[PDB]
Amino acid sequence: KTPPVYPVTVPFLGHIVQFGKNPLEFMQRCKRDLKSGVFTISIGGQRVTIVGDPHEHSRFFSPRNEILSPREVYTIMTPVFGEGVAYAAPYPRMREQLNFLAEELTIAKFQNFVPAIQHEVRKFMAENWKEDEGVINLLEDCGAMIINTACQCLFGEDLRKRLNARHFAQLLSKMESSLIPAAVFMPLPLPQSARCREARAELQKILGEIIVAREKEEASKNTSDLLGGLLKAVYRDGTRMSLHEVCGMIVAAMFAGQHTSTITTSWSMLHLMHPKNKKWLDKLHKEIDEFPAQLNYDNVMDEMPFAERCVRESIRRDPPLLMVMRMVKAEVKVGSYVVPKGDIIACSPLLSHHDEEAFPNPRLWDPERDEKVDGAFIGFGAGVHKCIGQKFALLQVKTILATAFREYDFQLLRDEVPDPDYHTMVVGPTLNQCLVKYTRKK
């Protein structure tokens, strides 16, 4: 009564290679050949069970940690975030920590993000896109805007002086590269590891200097930044976060937002600039050609409904995180099947977002589409572990789109839209394809 396995033919290596080259075509094949949305594969002799039937998402996102656990599956992050941070911490602390973070997105806070976001976007553009026309690599530039823009929202002035975006990005890169996606399924002292520690330590040292400089300061002077937020925070037992933990959280917050948003921004701009999608590009300008130079939280939140769809449909068609997993601590029901204890249960936004019923014509970028199966869209996950940076990411991306398409027009050099590059653990467009020509207006 367990879900149908997929033929192996190579015990030394599971479906690893097939999945790595193209996991969409591969997964759809499985789900197609076995006549079942729920199926099990073997990655290096380890049963990975995939809930690929959107109707059955709740069976994956609903179970509590005691039954379904991410900790063992997400071990690989521990080196990046810290030896005692989320997924490296007992869930009670983990959850506890993640909440502090969430309280940093009170949207009591967004009040000042729009002006900041636009301040960095306009600056970058007026710094890199000067000429009346020119060629840039969209993916690399959005990455710059993302990090730059994110720091201008969460990092205080004093911190940004010591740690600027350009520099912070290098640190993330240094440690995030330490990551081998394969490990997640298959549990070293590589040059990548070393760089990762130093980078986080460096970041550590600095954050230590700033705090010291803040605590010596007295006694007022207005809205505290992310770090300050984390520093104030106190546990359920009544103890303040250790810096090592505090650092980890910041890495986490920044790490998680860097690629997912960078990619989402890119895909969005790509589709939107494509001549085939003139329909929606126009519909977009129709929505932003009314806004003033200085945008405010209100109009980005409440006055850009079609732009949100653009971002959502981007994440829908090409989800940055193609799947999420958990260790099955106890046998869990799923459809007519049963997932045995020991399995790595996983749910794939990539797969689900391409189910014919939930999203007819999956490969078609349609911003006005809606899930034909409730719960089908899981770009930001769901249940207890539903993404926390959603509201922020969306705000961050939407505002960028508004500032970019307002002052520049774009043109995709390549005939069609970039192919997804499935080799990175966070998935976006290839970037050997992202070459774009911009044209300043007036």
Ligand X SMILES: CC[C@@H]([C@H](C)O)n1ncn(-c2ccc(N3CCN(c4ccc(OC[C@@H]5CC[C@@](Cn6cncn6)(c6ccc(F)cc6F)O5)cc4)CC3)cc2)c1=O
Feature table: binding site for heme: 387
38: enclosing H helix or E strand: strand 38-43
- Note whether 403 and 121 are within 8 A (CB): yes
Q: For ligand HEM, give the closer residue by CB, 70 or 248.
A: 70
Q: Which range of residues in 24-32, 54-62, 316-324, 428-436 is near ligand X by CB under 6 A? A: 316-324
Contact between 320 and ligand HEM by CB under 6 A: the answer reads: yes
Tell me the CA distances in angstroms from 57 to 28, 51, 108, 179, 293, one per residue in order.
Answer: 17, 7, 32, 28, 42
Contact between 5 and ligand HEM by CB under 6 A: the answer reads: no
Helix, strand, or coil (residue 391): helix
DSSP state of 217: S
* Contact map string, positions 324 to 363, toward ligand X, x by CB under 6 A: x---------------------------------------
Residues 18-57 that bind ligand X (CB under 6 A): 20
226: enclosing H helix or E strand: helix 226-232
261 binds, among ligand X, ligand HEM, none (CB under 5 to 8 A by kind): ligand HEM
Say which residues have a Cβ less than 8 Å from residue 396's Cβ, sequence separation at least 6.
113, 117, 146, 149, 150, 153, 257, 261
375 binds, among ligand HEM, ligand X, none (CB under 5 to 8 A by kind): none
The annotated binding site is made up of: 387
423 binds, among ligand X, ligand HEM, none (CB under 5 to 8 A by kind): ligand X
379 binds, among ligand X, ligand HEM, none (CB under 5 to 8 A by kind): ligand HEM
Helix, strand, or coil (residue 388): coil
Least separation in angstroms between residue 119's CB and ligand HEM is 19
Identify which of 143, 248, 173, 166 has the alpha carbon closest to the alpha carbon of residue 204.
248
Q: Which range of residues in 237-245, 271-279, 322-330, 332-340 is near ligand X by CB under 6 A? A: 322-330
Which of 74, 110, 124, 359 touches ligand X by CB under 6 A? Answer: 74
Residues 38-97 that bind ligand HEM (CB under 6 A): 70
Contact between 321 and ligand X by CB under 6 A: the answer reads: yes
Which of 387, 426, 431, 435 touches ligand HEM by CB under 6 A? Answer: 387
Distance, in Å, from the CA atom of 440 to the CA atom of 442, rounded to the nearest integer, reads: 7
Residues 164-183 that bind ligand X (CB under 6 A): 181-182
Phi, psi at 234, each rounded to 5° = -135, 140
Which of 212, 330, 423, 439 touches ligand X by CB under 6 A? Answer: 423
Q: What angle do CA 194, 84, 391 make, to 5 degrees?
A: 95
Question: Beta strand 68-69 with 420-421: parallel, antiparallel or unpaired?
Answer: unpaired
Distance, in Å, from the CA atom of 401 to the CA atom of 146, rounded to the nearest integer, reads: 12
* Contact map string, positions 322 to 341, toward ligand HEM, x by CB under 6 A: --x-----------------
Identify which of 359, 368, 350 has the alpha carbon closest to the alpha carbon of residue 19.
350
Provide Rg for the chain, Cα atoms: 22
Size of the site for ligand HEM (CB under 6 A): 22
Contact between 89 and ligand X by CB under 6 A: the answer reads: no
Phi, psi at 180, each rounded to 5° = -110, 110
Tell me the CA distances in angstroms from 107 to 102, 114, 299, 301, one per residue in order.
Answer: 10, 12, 14, 10
Contact between 270 and ligand HEM by CB under 6 A: the answer reads: no
Which of 184, 196, 227, 241 touches ligand X by CB under 6 A? Answer: 184
Least separation in angstroms between residue 313's CB and ligand X is 19
Q: Which residues bind to ligand HEM, rule: CB under 6 A?
A: 70, 98, 101, 253, 256-257, 260-261, 264, 315, 320-321, 324, 379-381, 385, 387-389, 392-393
Q: Which residues bind to ligand X, rule: CB under 6 A?
A: 16-17, 20, 74, 77, 86, 98, 181-182, 184, 252, 255-256, 260, 321-324, 387, 389, 423, 425
